């Protein structure tokens, strides 16, 4: 259902936000920790113990989960279609 153009952006869209989350939480009253946090959500694997202590990452993490859920649900419909 999804062409290779989509998979070109999937591998970078998840990665680009990883450094951003490390940027927001650190400079408020690392890279490896955030990398396992975002990718694990997409694959639904409980990897790593890193947690969004800062409130900014939590609200961004909240909407981020919804981005993964639509991908899985929609793709299942296409295959069944």
């Amino acid at each position: 259902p999804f062409q290779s153009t989509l998979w070109l952006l999937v591998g970078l869209s998840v990665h680009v936000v990883a450094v951003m989350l490390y940027l927001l939480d650190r400079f408020s009253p690392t890279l490896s920790s955030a990398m396992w946090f975002s990718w694990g959500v997409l694959l639904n694997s409980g990897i790593g113990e890193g947690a969004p202590r800062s409130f900014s990452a939590r609200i961004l993490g909240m909407v981020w989960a919804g981005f993964a859920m639509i991908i899985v649900a929609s793709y299942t419909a296409n295959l069944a279609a």
Binding site: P29, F55, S56, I59, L60, V63
Partner: peptide, 15 residues
């Protein structure tokens, strides 16, 4: 829409 969500709230946390 969520990209700038943290940027707006980032300033508000300082004060």
């Amino acid at each position: 829409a969520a990209m700038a969500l943290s940027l707006i709230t980032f300033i508000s946390e300082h004060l």
